[PDB]
Design a protein around this nucleic acid. Sequence first.
RNA 1: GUGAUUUCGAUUAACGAGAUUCCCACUGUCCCUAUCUA
RNA 2: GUGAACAGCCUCUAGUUGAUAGAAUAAUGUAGAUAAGGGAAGUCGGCAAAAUAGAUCCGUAACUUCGGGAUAAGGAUUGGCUCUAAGGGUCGGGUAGUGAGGGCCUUGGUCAGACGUAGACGGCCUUGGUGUCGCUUGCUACAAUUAACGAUCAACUU
RNA 3: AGCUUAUCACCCCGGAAUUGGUUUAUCCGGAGAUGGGGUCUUAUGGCUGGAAGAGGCCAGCACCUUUGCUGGCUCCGGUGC
RNA 4: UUCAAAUGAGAACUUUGAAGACUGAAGUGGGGAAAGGUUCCACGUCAACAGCAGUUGGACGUGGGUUAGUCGAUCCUAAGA
Lengths: 77, 50, 156, 106
Amino acid sequence: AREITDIKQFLELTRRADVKTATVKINKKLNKAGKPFRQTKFKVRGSSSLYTLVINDAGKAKKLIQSLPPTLKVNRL
Amino acid sequence: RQKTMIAEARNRKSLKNKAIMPRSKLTKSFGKMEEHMSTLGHDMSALQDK
Amino acid sequence: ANLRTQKRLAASVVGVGKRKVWLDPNETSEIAQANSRNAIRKLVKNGTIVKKAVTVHSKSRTRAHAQSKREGRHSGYGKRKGTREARLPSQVVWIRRLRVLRRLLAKYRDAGKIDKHLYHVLYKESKGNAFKHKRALVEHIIQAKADAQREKALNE
Amino acid sequence: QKIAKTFTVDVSSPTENGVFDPASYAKYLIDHIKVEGAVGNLGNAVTVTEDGTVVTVVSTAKFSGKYLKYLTKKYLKKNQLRDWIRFVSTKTNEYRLAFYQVTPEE
RNA sequence: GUGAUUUCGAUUAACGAGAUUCCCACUGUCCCUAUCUA
RNA sequence: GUGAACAGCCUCUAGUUGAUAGAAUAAUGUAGAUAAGGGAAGUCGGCAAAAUAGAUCCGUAACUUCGGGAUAAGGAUUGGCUCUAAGGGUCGGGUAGUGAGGGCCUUGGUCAGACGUAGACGGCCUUGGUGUCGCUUGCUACAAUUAACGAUCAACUU
RNA sequence: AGCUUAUCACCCCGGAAUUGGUUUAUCCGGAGAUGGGGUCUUAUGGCUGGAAGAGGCCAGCACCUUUGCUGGCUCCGGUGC
RNA sequence: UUCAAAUGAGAACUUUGAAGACUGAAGUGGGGAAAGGUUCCACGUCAACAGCAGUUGGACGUGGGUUAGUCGAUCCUAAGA
């Protein structure tokens, strides 16, 4: 299990040839004792490693979900 | 009455060896209910209907 | 009926000992029909088998006695059974005190209350057991600084 | 600082059955809530109101749901309501009075 | 072959499930038995 | 938990309730105790029991290979409770004074963000605010020879 | 798994008597102390990924049943011969 | 040790519930090496055995059960052979 930060690296990795499945996980958390906010984890299943990208912005997460490849099979929660 | 209640609690309770069973898990009866409500002086029609 | 197996399976399924599982004396045939862990789980769910609560071991008297000892009671010669050093090592006491003294000396030297030479003198003395405690070291420092001031003024 | 923690108690089931007194419940809470170690120092720090069905406790000095449940169970034992009333928590800080599991004999 | 050491074959502190004579204390060992529990 | 303590004693988790049973309660036997007055008179032989016992303070002989003897011997004390005294840690230096720097900048100003009447966040700035408070460096000015004090935190020992 | 995290040790500057630094335990310095700045091993700890979806504790639900479902919470500290 | 119920032709001794006790973390708790060899689990069963009894059993009859690239062996050398 590895955490990936760059969105460009995440997209190239999700286009990698060995990658077939990804997962979108929704968490409800608090920001600095603030309001309950949304966290989206994108977990791309590679041959060796599961790569996790953590996005704390719901709109950016939605737009990335749109940006995902079609052939990749996504499991929601 | 209070000394009698002391005796009743004495005979019911024995906690040096084991714990009292929880009333949440246990289940009582209309027999265990209506008589107690009568000695406490309440109505019974709603409970009878239920 | 023989519910030995059912008691064992209920203990395993609930996760407690056999001493903590209750089998309903009224549902004897129903429990006897339960030969599987799934059946045991169903009986646990619907209440035919119940996990008993732990036997209470309260610490109320222990906490009361600890609070009393904090207030300073039950600490007499009739209450002591081990030697004084077995109760509290004098070496531990010394290590505490000397670390306190060295810490204060270093703090004062760094802040500038004392110079290197007075710090060296006082370090050797604290190692030599001159000072009984922090207040004694502080007052001795004050007196020694006064002596140095008077000596310098008289040599002036 | 002065955060007014509010605890709600829905006694609708026993009240609509008709064998519980919200008036007596609020009276017991006022009489017996301890503030700073004593009963009767409530003023300006702990407030209790009735609404016929839901009893509200707005406190700002060392009050907890465990304490509320403790006082409610003391009241139920005093009025001999324990063996058929239970104090449960639906949501956080929102509690209610219900009845124990009573099977039908038939 | 002798078995610490010292001092003058004797002597020697410390130690011992080693040996012997007494002292205080203690007591059913005894005068002299009696009673209670399992 | 008690206590110096992996002691003994009581308890929680877990486990067990196994040992052929029942009814009676003479002597004797075994194990465990008590005892007037006397106190080794008993016996080959003080055998066995009794007495002593923890800890604090005082105090300690002959002899000695100077290391010991030594816990020598011998005294006082020990409960409960209410107090008094003592034993620590971490943070604290300034405004008199010039001017800039970091962040949701109360209110007020320009550029300016996709989705389901709403529209945050966000890529830019302040002499203000929480003689012009201040969180930051450069510095003159007793930097502390009273920080010889204060704010805050915590344990059990004497 | 990623980032980070250290006693010891080592490097650069500088040159020390009024000798200083320093451990519970006295060792260390012109073969270069004190001081300032660094570099290193990662025992070990921390944050994150694994991972809350798991596990735990509760509440509300059906109903001959070889049966499943729905919501909550699962947080923040302190201390020591 | 005791009370009640169930089972059973039959219950001081089996099973469940209720009480009373005990081992008291150097355990009457939980695991292994070695050794044993199926004693493990279930169903049925009581002629013999478990020094009373027995409906119980490590007994008898009949079946089921032991899953590894990472845990061991296997590899290395020791005293030795």
